[PDB]
From a paper:
Like other TGFβ proteins, BMPs are produced as single-chain polypeptides consisting of a larger pro-domain (30–40 kDa) and a smaller (12–15 kDa) mature signaling domain separated by one or more proteolytic cleavage sites. Signaling occurs when the mature domain, structurally reminiscent of two clasped hands complete with four β-strand “fingers” and a “wrist” helix for each monomer, combines two type 1 and two type 2 serine-threonine kinase receptors on the cell surface leading to intracellular cross-phosphorylation of the type 1 receptors and subsequent phosphorylation of specific SMAD transcription factors. For example, BMP2 can signal through the type 1 receptors Alk3 and Alk6 but maintains a higher affinity for Alk3. Growth and Differentiation Factor 5 (GDF5), on the other hand, strongly prefers signaling through Alk6 as compared to Alk3, leading to differences in signaling outcomes.
Using this protein, we were able to readily solve the X-ray crystal structure of BMP2/GDF5 to a resolution of 2.8 Å. As expected, the BMP2/GDF5 heterodimer displays the characteristic shape of a BMP growth factor, however, the dimer clearly displays an asymmetrical appearance. Here, due to the asymmetry of the ligand, the asymmetric unit consists of two full dimers. Compared to the apo-BMP structure, the BMP2 half of the heterodimer displays much less curvature in the β-strands that form the “fingers” of the BMP fold. In contrast, the GDF5 half exhibits slightly increased curvature of the β-strands compared to apo-GDF5. Thus, the fingers of the heterodimer can be described as opening on the BMP2 side and closing on the GDF5 side. This overall difference in curvature in the fingers across the dimer is responsible for the asymmetrical shape of the growth factor. The BMP2/GDF5 heterodimer possesses two unique type 1 receptor binding sites, BFGW with this inhibitory Arg located in the wrist helix and GFBW with the more permissive Ala. Indeed, superposition of both Alk3 and Alk6 into this site shows that R438 would sterically clash with Alk3, much like in homodimeric GDF5. Thus, while the BFGW site maintains the discriminatory R438 residue of GDF5, the overall shape of the pocket is more open, which might allow the receptors to position themselves slightly differently than that observed for the homodimers.
Residue numbers in the entry:
A (entry chain A): 11 to 114
B (entry chain B): 16 to 120
Write the structure that this text describes.
């Protein structure tokens, strides 16, 4: 199934120029969501009343797009950086890692 | 602009066959979200931190990582008057039926 699934995505901090700020970690798995939403009433696709209706309109009218596959649960991740006094400090960043996908 | 925006969408319950349970309304405006998610990202479309990162990664290498989707970010309800599985008449509020704003996710 090429349907709505989570997909691997690793963001390396060397490759974007951030590793002289973020002493740790060196990267993290964010993942992304992609795939078709033909039947958003599938219990595993968390869906909205709106996505279901719209997907229904799509089957009769191709000019209305189907619902889009997007993250529906995101978790935080922590990094370590240097203080103004060069003290190691942790900082949490919300909504960074896909935990579940769905149709919206 | 082909940028993520809100568009009209007329929902006709008679065309789906739900005349049978539904009494009123038999048609309503639901809207939908269509458009490009790319830099620059308007901040009043409150994009999630994850969506920013995905847009960045798609900006760097559009193979292997795709852009975010234009989808609803606030919805409102309508109330429907219809006939129960038990054959009663009821008036229930259905959540997330009308798009109020779009965004990138």
């Amino acid at each position: 199934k090429s349907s709505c699934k989570r997909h691997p995505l690793y963001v390396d901090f060397s490759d974007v120029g951030w590793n002289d700020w973020i002493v740790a970690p060196p990267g993290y798995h964010a993942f992304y969501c992609h795939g078709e939403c033909p039947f958003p009433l599938a219990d595993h696709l968390n869906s909205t009343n709106h996505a279901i209706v719209q997907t229904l309109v799509n089957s009769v009218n191709s000019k209305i797009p189907k619902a889009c596959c997007v993250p529906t649960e995101l978790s935080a991740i922590s990094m370590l950086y240097l203080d103004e006094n060069e003290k190691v400090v942790l900082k949490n960043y919300q909504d960074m890692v896909v935990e579940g996908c769905g149709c919206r | 602009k082909a940028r993520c925006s809100r568009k009209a969408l007329h929902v006709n319950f008679k065309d789906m066959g739900w005349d049978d349970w539904i009494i009123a309304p038999l048609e309503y405006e639901a809207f939908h979200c269509e458009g490009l998610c790319e830099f620059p990202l308007r901040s009043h479309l409150e994009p999630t931190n994850h969506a920013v990162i995905q847009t960045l990664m798609n900006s760097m290498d559009p193979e292997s990582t795709p852009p975010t989707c234009c989808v609803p970010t606030r919805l409102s309800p309508i109330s429907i008057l219809f006939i129960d599985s038990a054959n009663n008449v009821v008036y229930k509020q259905y959540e997330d039926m009308v798009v109020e704003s779009c965004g990138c996710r």
